[PDB]
Design an enzyme around this catalytic site. Sequence first.
Site, PDB file in Angstrom:
ATOM      1  N   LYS A   1      53.675 -59.525 -39.972  1.00  0.00           N
ATOM      2  CA  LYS A   1      52.487 -59.606 -40.881  1.00  0.00           C
ATOM      3  C   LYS A   1      52.682 -58.742 -41.893  1.00  0.00           C
ATOM      4  O   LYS A   1      52.403 -57.660 -42.050  1.00  0.00           O
ATOM      5  CB  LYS A   1      50.784 -59.488 -39.647  1.00  0.00           C
ATOM      6  CG  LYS A   1      49.677 -60.221 -40.104  1.00  0.00           C
ATOM      7  CD  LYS A   1      49.017 -59.499 -39.320  1.00  0.00           C
ATOM      8  CE  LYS A   1      47.470 -59.922 -40.768  1.00  0.00           C
ATOM      9  NZ  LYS A   1      46.364 -59.562 -39.642  1.00  0.00           N
TER      10      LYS A   1
ATOM     11  N   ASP B   1      43.535 -58.144 -46.818  1.00  0.00           N
ATOM     12  CA  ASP B   1      42.748 -58.845 -45.429  1.00  0.00           C
ATOM     13  C   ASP B   1      41.434 -58.782 -46.056  1.00  0.00           C
ATOM     14  O   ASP B   1      40.596 -58.122 -44.851  1.00  0.00           O
ATOM     15  CB  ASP B   1      43.117 -58.795 -44.175  1.00  0.00           C
ATOM     16  CG  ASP B   1      42.779 -60.382 -42.794  1.00  0.00           C
ATOM     17  OD1 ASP B   1      42.281 -60.885 -43.956  1.00  0.00           O
ATOM     18  OD2 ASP B   1      42.593 -59.761 -42.025  1.00  0.00           O
TER      19      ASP B   1
ATOM     20  N   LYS C   1      35.069 -60.810 -45.037  1.00  0.00           N
ATOM     21  CA  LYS C   1      34.791 -59.894 -44.201  1.00  0.00           C
ATOM     22  C   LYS C   1      33.316 -58.958 -45.202  1.00  0.00           C
ATOM     23  O   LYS C   1      33.363 -58.792 -46.173  1.00  0.00           O
ATOM     24  CB  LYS C   1      35.510 -58.478 -44.132  1.00  0.00           C
ATOM     25  CG  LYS C   1      37.134 -58.889 -43.193  1.00  0.00           C
ATOM     26  CD  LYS C   1      38.151 -58.071 -43.632  1.00  0.00           C
ATOM     27  CE  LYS C   1      39.254 -58.060 -42.665  1.00  0.00           C
ATOM     28  NZ  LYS C   1      38.980 -58.340 -41.126  1.00  0.00           N
TER      29      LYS C   1
ATOM     30  N   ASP D   1      46.790 -53.962 -43.076  1.00  0.00           N
ATOM     31  CA  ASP D   1      47.142 -55.095 -42.445  1.00  0.00           C
ATOM     32  C   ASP D   1      48.478 -55.625 -42.747  1.00  0.00           C
ATOM     33  O   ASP D   1      49.016 -56.725 -42.453  1.00  0.00           O
ATOM     34  CB  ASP D   1      46.275 -56.625 -43.138  1.00  0.00           C
ATOM     35  CG  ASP D   1      45.556 -57.353 -41.852  1.00  0.00           C
ATOM     36  OD1 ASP D   1      45.775 -56.865 -40.788  1.00  0.00           O
ATOM     37  OD2 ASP D   1      45.215 -58.567 -42.538  1.00  0.00           O
TER      38      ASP D   1
ATOM     39  N   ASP E   1      40.126 -65.832 -41.805  1.00  0.00           N
ATOM     40  CA  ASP E   1      39.496 -64.313 -41.631  1.00  0.00           C
ATOM     41  C   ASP E   1      40.463 -64.037 -40.590  1.00  0.00           C
ATOM     42  O   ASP E   1      41.131 -63.340 -40.185  1.00  0.00           O
ATOM     43  CB  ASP E   1      39.333 -63.225 -41.240  1.00  0.00           C
ATOM     44  CG  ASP E   1      39.052 -61.980 -41.044  1.00  0.00           C
ATOM     45  OD1 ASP E   1      39.840 -61.827 -42.010  1.00  0.00           O
ATOM     46  OD2 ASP E   1      37.725 -61.317 -40.929  1.00  0.00           O
TER      47      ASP E   1
ATOM     48  N   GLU F   1      43.792 -65.554 -39.662  1.00  0.00           N
ATOM     49  CA  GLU F   1      45.608 -65.417 -40.933  1.00  0.00           C
ATOM     50  C   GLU F   1      46.737 -64.824 -40.958  1.00  0.00           C
ATOM     51  O   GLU F   1      47.408 -65.483 -40.942  1.00  0.00           O
ATOM     52  CB  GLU F   1      44.807 -64.672 -42.734  1.00  0.00           C
ATOM     53  CG  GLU F   1      45.297 -63.710 -42.200  1.00  0.00           C
ATOM     54  CD  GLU F   1      44.264 -62.203 -41.728  1.00  0.00           C
ATOM     55  OE1 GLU F   1      42.876 -62.185 -41.810  1.00  0.00           O
ATOM     56  OE2 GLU F   1      45.170 -61.043 -41.817  1.00  0.00           O
TER      57      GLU F   1
ATOM     58  N   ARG G   1      47.486 -64.701 -37.866  1.00  0.00           N
ATOM     59  CA  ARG G   1      48.577 -65.846 -36.470  1.00  0.00           C
ATOM     60  C   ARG G   1      49.549 -66.346 -36.810  1.00  0.00           C
ATOM     61  O   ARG G   1      50.006 -67.342 -36.288  1.00  0.00           O
ATOM     62  CB  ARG G   1      47.884 -66.213 -35.393  1.00  0.00           C
ATOM     63  CG  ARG G   1      46.187 -66.501 -35.877  1.00  0.00           C
ATOM     64  CD  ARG G   1      45.954 -67.465 -34.856  1.00  0.00           C
ATOM     65  NE  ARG G   1      45.048 -65.842 -34.904  1.00  0.00           N
ATOM     66  CZ  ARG G   1      43.509 -65.680 -33.655  1.00  0.00           C
ATOM     67  NH1 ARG G   1      43.481 -66.843 -33.578  1.00  0.00           N
ATOM     68  NH2 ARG G   1      43.562 -64.192 -33.657  1.00  0.00           N
TER      69      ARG G   1
HETATM   70 MN   LIG Z   1      42.025 -60.970 -40.812  1.00  0.00          MN
HETATM   71 MN   LIG Z   2      44.167 -59.433 -40.928  1.00  0.00          MN
END
Ligand SMILES: [Mn+2]
Ligand SMILES: [Mn+2]
Lengths: 519, 519, 519
Positions: free
Chosen positions: B287, B292, B299, B310, B369, B371, B373
Site C-alpha cells: 500500500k 491519505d 478526515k 500511509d 477513506d 482506499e 483495500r
Molecule cells: Mn483511508
Molecule cells: Mn489509508
Amino acid sequence: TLPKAEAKELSAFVQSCVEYKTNVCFTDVAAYESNQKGVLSSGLAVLVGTHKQLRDPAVQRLPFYNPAVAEAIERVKEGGTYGVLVEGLANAAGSKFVRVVVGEVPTKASRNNCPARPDVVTALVTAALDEVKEPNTTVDVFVLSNAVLPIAAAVARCGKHNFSAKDGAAAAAYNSGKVSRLQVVFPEPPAIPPKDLEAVATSTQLCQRLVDAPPNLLTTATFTEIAQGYAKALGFDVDVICGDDLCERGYGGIYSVGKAAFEAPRLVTLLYTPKGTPVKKVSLVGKGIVYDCGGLALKPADYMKLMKHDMGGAAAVFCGFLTAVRLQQPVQLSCTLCLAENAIGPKSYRNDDIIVMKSGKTVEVINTDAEGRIVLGDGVFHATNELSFTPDVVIDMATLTGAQGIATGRHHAGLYVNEEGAEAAMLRAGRESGETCFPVLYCPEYHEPEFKSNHADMTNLMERRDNAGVSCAGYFITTHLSPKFTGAHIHVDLAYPVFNSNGATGFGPALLTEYFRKL
Amino acid sequence: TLPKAEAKELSAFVQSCVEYKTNVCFTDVAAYESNQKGVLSSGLAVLVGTHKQLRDPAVQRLPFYNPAVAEAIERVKEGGTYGVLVEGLANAAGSKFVRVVVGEVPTKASRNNCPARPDVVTALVTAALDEVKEPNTTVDVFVLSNAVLPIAAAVARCGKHNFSAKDGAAAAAYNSGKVSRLQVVFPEPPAIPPKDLEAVATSTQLCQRLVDAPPNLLTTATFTEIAQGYAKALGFDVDVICGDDLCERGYGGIYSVGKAAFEAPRLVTLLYTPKGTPVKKVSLVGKGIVYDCGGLALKPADYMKLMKHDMGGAAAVFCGFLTAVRLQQPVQLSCTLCLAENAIGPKSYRNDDIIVMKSGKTVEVINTDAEGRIVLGDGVFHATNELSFTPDVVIDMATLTGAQGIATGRHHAGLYVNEEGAEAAMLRAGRESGETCFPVLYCPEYHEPEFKSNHADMTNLMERRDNAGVSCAGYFITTHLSPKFTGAHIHVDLAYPVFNSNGATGFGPALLTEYFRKL
Amino acid sequence: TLPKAEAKELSAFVQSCVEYKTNVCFTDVAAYESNQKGVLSSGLAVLVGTHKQLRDPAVQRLPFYNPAVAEAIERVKEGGTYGVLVEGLANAAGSKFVRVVVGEVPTKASRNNCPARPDVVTALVTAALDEVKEPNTTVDVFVLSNAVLPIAAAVARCGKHNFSAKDGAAAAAYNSGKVSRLQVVFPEPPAIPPKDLEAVATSTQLCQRLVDAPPNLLTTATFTEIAQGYAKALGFDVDVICGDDLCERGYGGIYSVGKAAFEAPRLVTLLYTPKGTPVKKVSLVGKGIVYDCGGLALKPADYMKLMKHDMGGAAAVFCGFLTAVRLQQPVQLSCTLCLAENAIGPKSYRNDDIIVMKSGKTVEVINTDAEGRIVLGDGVFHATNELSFTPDVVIDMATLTGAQGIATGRHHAGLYVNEEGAEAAMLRAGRESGETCFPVLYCPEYHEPEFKSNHADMTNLMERRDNAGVSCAGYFITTHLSPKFTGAHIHVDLAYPVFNSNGATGFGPALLTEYFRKL
Ligand SMILES: [Mn+2]
Ligand SMILES: [Mn+2]
Ligand SMILES: [Mn+2]
Ligand SMILES: [Mn+2]
Ligand SMILES: [Mn+2]
Ligand SMILES: [Mn+2]
C-alpha cells in the site's frame, strides 16, 4: 478564464472601491447657523450626548429645540433613543413635521475604554437613522462631544453599510442606495480639520466595504487591482509578487497557503515616503486571507460562515496607509498585503507538508487552518529584509485566532508586543481613536516549546491549545523577522473587532492614523 | 507543471534516497582491539546489555572499563541509562574525558516477543546518543548480545533520523547533519557477515527516510523515480503503469482512488530473479498511499496528521526487495507498489461510485477513506494474474486500519493468513528479526457478509465496524486474488508499528529478509 | 454514615495535613562550611545556576568541585542537567562515589516573567532528584542565585510529591516514603531568614498536598477539619456555616451548588488579627470546589479528570493565610473558604433554577458547570458584608475558567482587577515570588450585557462565550460585592497554574505572602 459577465462585474466592483467617496461631512454649530440660517437639511435631526451635555444651556440655542425636545431629553434612557415630532420647523425637504431623535451616551468608561464611548454613539445614530422616511436625504447629526476623531469614525461606522446587494444594487456595482448623507455638527470648530476627518471616515468605510464584500467579489486579484488603482490615483509605489513567482523567489509560506485556489496568491507591497524628513519608518503587514475555508483542515459550515472577514487585517492596514497618504502624515510607510485564499483541492498544502519559508526556516504544517501565521511570517520577513529601508517599527494586523475573542473580547484587539513603550503607545492610540486594544501575554520563553517539531525547525500549531493562544500565534510570526531588524514589533489580533452582527466595523485604520499622529 | 525551484528540490530528494548510505557499521571485540588498539573512536562510548551480561568477566576487558563504569553498572535501572566520565582514556577525538553510557536491557520477554528485546536496545542507544557533544563523530556501541539481526535493525532505527529539514538541511537534499556514525561492536564475530548487516541497516533507514518524508517531497512520481534509480543501479526490471493507462487497462481500483490527485497514480512492479534455482516464488504487494486525506470522506485534522506514513507498506516491501537483491537471496521476487494520493477535489471518487476492479469484480464505495483495500485489491490481482510467473506466496503489507492498533497494538503488526504454516513462519521471522507480528482472526465465512451490496458484487466497508476490523479488510483484499493462485496469502497490517513519537521506525524490511532467509 | 474503615482513613489523612512538616531547609555556603566542614550530607549533590554563575571562580571553592564537575559545566545544555561521579569525596552516607548533578538555568526572561526563572530551577532539581539511590537521605542543593523567595518556593515544588498512594503509603496516611530531605545552600546568607523560608516552603507543599489529594480523601468535611486543626494549633478564629444552615441564613449560591453532594457544603471563615496598632485589612476568598463533575451539566470523562484540582483557590488562600499567621505578618486577614462538591443527583441544582444569593440578587442558572462564580459570589458578599470589619482589599482566588489557559496560559494566573494600583502590585508580587500573573481585560460596561436574564437579575453564564471569558466570570463575582465595600478587588483566575503534568504545583500561597509583604 472567468465568464465575461463575471469579469465585467468584478471590474465594476473594483472601480466602486477605487472611487469610493464617503457619505459623511463635518462642521460646527456656528458654521451651520451661518450657512443654513436655521433651516434643517431634512425631516430628520439627531441629537447625541451625555446626560450632562444634553442639559447644557447651549442645547437650547439649537435650531430644532423646543419643549417636546426638552421632554425627550427627560424621557430618554441611558444608551437609548427617544424621538419627537416638531411641527412647522423649517427644513430643506419641505416636510411638515421634523422628527428629532435624542440619544443619551453613558459617561461610565473603564480605564481600558475610550472615555467618549463612541461605541454607543455608533449604536444611537444607527437606531435614529432607522427612522429615515425618504432616500437621498441629508441628516443633520448634532453631537455634543468634542472628541472629534473617535466620533468621526463612530459615525462613519454607523447606519446602513455602503456595500449592498439588496434591491438591484448588484447592477450599480454593489453601491447601496439606502445610505443617508450625514452632516455631523460639532459644538466647536473641530481640532482636526473637516477635510481630514472626511479622509478618516472614508478609510473606515472603505475598510468596511472591503470586509463586507463576499469573496466572489473581493478576491486576491480584485484586492490587488484596487491597490493598483489607488497607487495610480495618489502616486505611491506598488510592488506585486504573483503566483508561481512566489515559489521561485522563496516565499514558500504564502505560496503554499494560496496555491490551491482559483485565484493565485499575491504579496503586494505599497510604499509611501513623505516630503521632508520622516519621524519614523514603519512597515505594515496585513493578513489578507480573502476566504479561510480551512484548507484540508476543513472548517464545519457554522465556523466557515463570515470567513470573508479573514482579510480584515489587510483592509485595516491598506486603509490606514491610504489615510496617511491623503493626509500627508510624516511617516515613511511600507504596507505589505499577504493575499491568499485558503482553499481546498488537489493542490492544497497538507497537514504533514514541510514549508521552506522566505526566512529560511522550515515549518511543519500540523493544521492547514492555521494559515494566517504562515502568510504573515513571509510578510514580516519581506518587510524587514527585502525593502530599500529597514523599519523602526513593524505592525502586523490580522484576524488571526478564535482565542482572541475568548481572551480580550469583541471590542478589544489583542496586542502582542516586544517592547513596553510601543505597546503603551498603541493602547493610548486605541483609547483616543475608539478602536480599543488590550495586551496579551508576551513571554517567548513559554511560547517557544509549543512549536517543537521532529523534522522541521518548527510546527505551525501549538501542541497544547490552552497555553496563551493569542500570544503563541504572535510568537510564531516573530520567528520569521529578519535578524537585520532590531526595532519594535506590534502584533494586532483583531479577529472579532472587525465585525459585529450588522457586518464589518471598519476597525483598524483610525487606530493606525492616531498611532502615526503621536509618533 | 510544477515551479522550477520545486522540481529541482524533488530531483535532489530523489537522488538523496537513491544514493542513501547507512551511518552504521558492524564489527566485533577482537577485530576492534586489533584495528583500533584500545583507542576509542570518540569522546562517547555506549555499553548495552542485560543485568547478567553486564556482570560477565569479559566486560572488564573492554577498553573503557574502570571502577566508575563498574559503579554505573550497579546504579543503572532496568530499561534505563547511566552515564559516567572516564578521565585520560585514549580516543581519536583527543577529548580529555570520555563519556561512557551504560544501558540495561530487560530479560523479561513474553512468548510473542523477541527474547533479545531490541525495542529497549533502540531506546537505550537513542537516549545515550542524546549526550553527543560534536557533529560528525563516530560512536562506539558495545553490545553484549549476539542476536545480530535484531540488534542491527534496532541500532539502525535508533537516534536522530537521516531525514531532516532542520537548520538549513533543506538545501542539502534533507540529509540530516545531526546523525552520528555508529560502530556496533558485538562480543563475537557476527554469525551474519558485517557487509550483510550493513545492507539490512541501510534498508531499515531508507524505509524510515521514505516514511518520514513529507508528501510534498515523497509523491507518487518521486517514489516511482526512486524505484527506477535503484533498478538502473542494481540491474532489476521495472514496470510502470501510469495514470489514465490504469483506467484503459482495467485497473479501476487504483485508478479511482488516485485520480483526483495532482500527481497521477502508478502501479509499479519490480522483478528480481536469482542466478540459481529459486527456493520459492514470492510476490510482494505494498500500500503506497503517499497521503491519505480520506478523499470525499475527509478526515478531521487530528486524524489527517501523520497520514504521510500511509505508504509505509510500500516502503517496507520496496526496501525488503532491495535487501534481497543486494544480498542475492535465492528467492524469486515481484514487488508491486500501489502508489496513489487519496485526494479531495472535483475528480474525487465518490461515496456511491461503483468501481470495476482489475479482477472483474465490482465494488460499491461506501467510504472513500477505506482506499487501501481497494488499491491492494488491484495490486494482488496484478501479482497473481498478470506476471510471467505465478507466485507460491503473496505477501501484502499495508498501513491499513485503525482497528490494527486496538487489536494487536503499536509493536505488533497484525497477520491475516490463509494457511497455518505460512503464518507460523512469519511469526517466527518477526520474533527473530524483532519486527514482531501477531495473528488476527482468519474466518472468511464470518467476514464475507459484512460486505453485502445491493447493486455491486461487494462494498468496500464493513456494515458492522465492530466485527473483526483487521480481518475484514484482509478478507476484502483476498476476494481479488486471481483464481490461478492456489498458494499462501499473508496480509500484514502494520498501521501502527511503522511509526512512534519520534517518527518512522523502518518496520518491515528486516521482517521480510528474515522470512526469506528461512524459506 | 460512612464505613468505619473509611472514617479512620479520613481522620488519619486529616492529621497528616494538620501536622505536615516540610522536607526542605535553608542555609548558605559559609554556614555550611562551618557546620559540615566539607562533608556532604549524602552521595548526591546538586549544582544549579546560569551559564555565567556556573563559571564564577567562587564555584571552584565548593567542596565537591573537581575537573569532572568542571567538564559537567562545559557539557550541560541550557535547561538541562549533566551528572558525574566524584571518587573519594567525604560524605555522611559513607558512599565511595558521590554523584554531582549540574543544571543550567537560562538568563532569558521576558518582562512578564521572574528574572531568576524558578520554573527551570524546579525542573532541574526534579530531574537531579530522580538519580537518588537510597530513601530518607539528605540532598545538598547548591544554588548560585540569591533570589531567595522564588528559589525557596521552586525547590519546595520540585521532585516527588509528599502526597502518595504508591507502595503501601495508604497505610501511612498517604505520606510519601519517596521524598528526599533537601538542604538548599545559597551563596550568601539569605535576605529572608531560613525559618521564614521554611514556613513558605511548608505552605507551598501543604497546598500541593491538598490539591493532589483525591476527592475521596479531601472532602468538604476533611478540608473543614484541617482548617479547624490549624486554628486550635495556631490560635486563630474559625467560623463554620454548614449544610442546611447555609439555606436558612440566605447563602443560596453555595447551598444550591453543594446540596446534591454526599458531604454538605460549608462556608468556612478564618480570622487573624496581628498584635498592636491597626494595619491593612484584607479579605481572602477561595473557590473550594472539592470536585467539579459539572452537576447536571455533566462534564465528559476527558474533562472531568483532574477536577479534584478545583479547590486549588481555596488551598492557595488557606495556605497564604497560614504563612501570614506563622510569620506574624502585620496584615489583618479574613479567609473565607467556599467549600462544596458540584455533584449530580436528585437534589442537583438545575439548568433553569433561580437562586437567591446572599447579596439579595437573583441568578438564573444557565449552566450548572459555571458553579465557581456562584459560590464565590456568596463568599465575597460574606467577606464584604458579614464580618466584624470591612476590608480594604478583597482577593478571590479560583480555578475558575478554561478561558484562563487560552488567554494567559499555563504559568500565568489571570488578573481581573478594579484598580490599576492593586493590579500593578499583584503583578510585582508574581514576578518577585515566581508565581507569575498577567492581567485580563477589565471593562464592566462590556461584560454586563452578557448576563442579561428574562426573569432574574442575572444569569450565571455569558450569552456569547467568545467575549472575554476570564473577565466576565470576574465581573459576575463583583456584582455580589456588598455596597459597604469601596476598596480594591483582585480576582485571580489560577485554573492552569495550580497544576502541571506531575500534579499540583502549590501555586498561590507565595504570591500572597509576597503581596502582603509589600503592602
Ligand atoms: Mn483511508
Ligand atoms: Mn489509508
Ligand atoms: Mn484565517
Ligand atoms: Mn484559518
Ligand atoms: Mn469548577
Ligand atoms: Mn464547573
